[model samples]
Target chain A: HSHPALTPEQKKELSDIAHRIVAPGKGILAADESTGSIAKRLQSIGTENTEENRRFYRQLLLTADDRVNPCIGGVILFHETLYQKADDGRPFPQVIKSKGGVVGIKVDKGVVPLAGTNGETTTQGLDGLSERCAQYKKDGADFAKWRCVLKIGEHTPSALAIMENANVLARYASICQQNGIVPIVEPEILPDGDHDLKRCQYVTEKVLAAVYKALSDHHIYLEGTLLKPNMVTPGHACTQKYSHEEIAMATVTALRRTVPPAVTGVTFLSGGQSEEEASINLNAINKCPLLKPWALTFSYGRALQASALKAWGGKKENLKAAQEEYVKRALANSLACQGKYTP
Target chain B: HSHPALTPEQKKELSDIAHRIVAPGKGILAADESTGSIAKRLQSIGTENTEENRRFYRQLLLTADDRVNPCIGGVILFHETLYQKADDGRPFPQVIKSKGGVVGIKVDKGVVPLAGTNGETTTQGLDGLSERCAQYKKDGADFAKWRCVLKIGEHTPSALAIMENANVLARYASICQQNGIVPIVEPEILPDGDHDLKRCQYVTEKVLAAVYKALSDHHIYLEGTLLKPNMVTPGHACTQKYSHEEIAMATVTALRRTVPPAVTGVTFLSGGQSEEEASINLNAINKCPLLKPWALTFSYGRALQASALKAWGGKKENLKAAQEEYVKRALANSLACQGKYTP
Candidate 1:
């Protein structure tokens, strides 16, 4: 009954790509904000959300100096950026490859209502995924990302939402693997509730357990897959505060109990954490003392880009300043993934 | 976080219907054999697989005398039988209601292969379920059945299968409640492997836990749903043999740990158990020392009809004998559900 869905060669190819994306002292640069998400970031800096501006912003990140080559193992690109050309006339993928980083794409359409729940949703975009993955692979993408959002409350993330989202993620991962793309399985529990650290840990364990079980059922080659999950922390509005060590212990303990050792990596999503806070928490996670089998690193969006966006301020003269800010965080997180970050 | 999917009035209506189907000393008559399944039953009796033969067989069971009135609480019908009339021109639902049994319909479209699984499957038929349930309610069907099959193997019933099937069942249940129908949620683990009772029990617990959790996530009103589960028993090819008491203990313990008290009833599918064996095991389940929060009863197919079908022998003259055989088992299971069976 345990028939292998992937041939040995296919497995080896996927496994190699996954390992490359999470090499030691390396992590992903989550620059794959959708057009709508990028609109908010651009608006925060009083810039219009136009295609050219989006392209320029991404080019600034991808063209960071050689100092970031070892720090950034992968750079996630939105669909638009993948096909966009740099000021130098090179495709964004070529630029990332030229800088020694693999390329990833965001494949999920977005969250849709689950019909009968407390405002919960399951990510769609699974329609025609195999063909899309094939196209993405041919276009130079080595990995893909899909995010399923779950919420926490007295009765949130109901069993229906968890199972539905988990099954969908497995289906997405299966399709991506069939087309030679390693999937970064992301089931994000939003940090919006007033729940405490223990509650977040409990929920994280249950969610990851379902996700892995689903992947196993779909016969996913665990060694060829990466997990992009939320780190354990108190809800944003919680009255209680916790130490970075406490958060690290809870996050690692939850992952150890649920994640299989065969998975290639565990890339933590910096769910709304400040830049310094996210880096510190990740550093503590690497220092967690428990035996972690996979690379534990950051796949952050706002946390990795907040200072860079502020530095650039939508001005051409500030482009070098923005690249410098981006490189600084990349190096910091690269060190954090190896438990070597000092600040 | 806990937005109620069902209004108080709707919940009350569904809860009442579910409770009525598993009333004290009463259980279901699972006469809803699909056309393909009935063909096999008729072949064994040397009868032609025609509409009339199927109707006559189901008519014989439904029209059994007052002896089964208190014993049988509900009768599940395949789509074809739900509208067919008795010889006297009375509808099957009318005959069933006249005999004090509620009418139930089997709504699942049957199992489809889950790619990459080791012959595992998830039930479909949810495409137009909400509208179909509304129509079934208007057609005198007060409850519905959807069977999801899971198998036990070295690496089978994988997490994907369990979560996929569980989520589908929850979706089906949610749709049913929205349209005034009680759902008999059946996630049946086939007893076809060489696993021991403990393995079966472990798998059953895990599967049911996922099922209940999905139901919770989907905001399904648990009191409105009835669970039709396979009793925890050693696989048919298992080398080790166990007594009826051992099987009962395993089944009860598994159910006690995973099934919430809010569920109205737990009806056991006989799987492939013989008539007498099924009754005795069900009696043992009722007699188990643990405190079962829900009504424990039987919703059997072959276990309730083997003798009756054999007695009919496709001969008109044996109608009375067939009805008698049916009544005998009905009485036996009625006693079984109350822990009063002598067999």
Candidate 2:
């Protein structure tokens, strides 16, 4: 099955986009929160969830000062934001492109229940995805993101969930590449249970192994793909705690065993970590005493926005402050991706 | 993930059907050739490829005397044959049921080319599989067969092929169980390469590992599914030869490492093996001196029917002679499955 799935030009375009998203000292700013998700974030800040408010919040990040221009290599946009314009009337994609940031769109619909599983689900949005991807490419998006969630528990993330999610992600990736869009394949194992660090690492390895194998089976151009995996960390309710260095060691070790060197980059999802914690862990991961072929970087959403959202408080007066907070995290993660961050 | 996909009663019914199809000293007669495949067989025998001729041929095997009944546990039929009638006007399924054999139907459409693979393909026929399975269950069929072909060669049976096929087989199995039919998961690795026995064994282990892992991921009840696998052996064009003992040991070792104990049975596919060679290998497999938790038996097509087809020679006068040839192989395989055949 050595048939080439993509032309040399297509492969080159995808690989270049993937590499640009994870450049040496830069990573993605995952501001692609769905409208429904943004509602929760807005509610947390006592703001009404409206299209204008969502657009304003996104503009605050996308239009950040030139200080962050080199720090943010990519900006992931929700569909609404992708089509929305800034106060200056420039489209969000155009604004990001102007800042030297590649534009990516969130392509997955959302999670749907998998029949006969323990409330487990596979992501849906594959219907008409190719067309949607082709349109998105024409609309300035150079990459796409799809998230399939897995949970850690006894008899959870069952083999079926892993295989199903991995296959779906691969299918999504294949279609994205076919349309000149790099795919950020994310199979996020939720940190919900009380599992320890070791258990988390074990599951991460197994999950990544399945994911990469599926990618290979689908003949995905690894060089044209970016992985948005969750960092290997102890479950939230776990009584035992682990050091940043330990978590980093486990995370890197798992990736080393599973993620092939051909993959362009490993841009990790922050999952539920705090901004400080996310940066610290990322720095440790990059500093881990092992060879990491792919760029180890961040594609954080909540971790990159919590403080910024709180600072903004849905008030115009807080815009500069929120942008500063966002820029701070961006710079920290930029250094972290290069193993140069200090706390 | 721990939520059961099948109720206790459903599980029991499926498990029972699977067990019955691979009962001790008995095995499946895989006559589920598609119309196109049967046409080829008919041409080889210089017989007309008419529906009546096919019906008559199937009837000869189903109506074999009581002595052969004890040696045949199941009869897999193509869709046409399942609805075909014997010379006495009895439905073929009824004839097989009367002879104490479970009736199985082939459900896969056929293989389709996987884009970008080196001529590799995955089995289709999954569209509306649930409804088809439900209907088949009502049509005197208790089990189903879907074959996914994999060829061994350098840079062949690519990772994409293994994964796509394994996932498809799992999906087929899950659907069959939901509709009250036992699914015979067939991931057949073709013996068309010049690879050594060690290579074949390695590939078998990797492929089976992926298959079972997928079954688990899909929440397929292991006890309700039967595995139809290619026996471990060197490629047909290999320079060096190995004994049946070596083949058996390699086969069993691969199974022990991958297939779970809860699986009901493993019915080996006779992929291009001659009649005598198939029986001898099966006998050696049963005598491999390993703790095999599930039944290990034959699910032969060509190996079981080659002699019979040759005997009949499209001549009505040779009906009794054709039946005798088929019965002889049935009895021989019966002993072989019990490790009592002396070659």
Q: List TM-scores for all candidates, in order.
A: 0.60, 0.61
Q: DockQ for all models, in order? A: 0.18, 0.21
Among these predictions, the greatest TM-score belongs to 2
Worst 10 residues of 1 chain B by lDDT: B122-131
Off by over 4 Å in 1: A7-163, A169-217, A220-343
Residues A23-121, candidate 2: write the lDDT tens digits. Answer: 898899999988788889999989999989999999998999998888888889999989999999999999999999999999998875554777777
Across B25-122, the per-residue lDDT of candidate 2 in tens digits comes to 88999989988899999999778888888888888878888888878999899999899998889999999889889999999888766657777777
Summarize candidate 1's per-residue lDDT along B130-193 as a digit string, tens digits: 7778898988999999999999988988877898888888878877888899999999999998
lDDT (CA) for every model shown? 0.90, 0.89
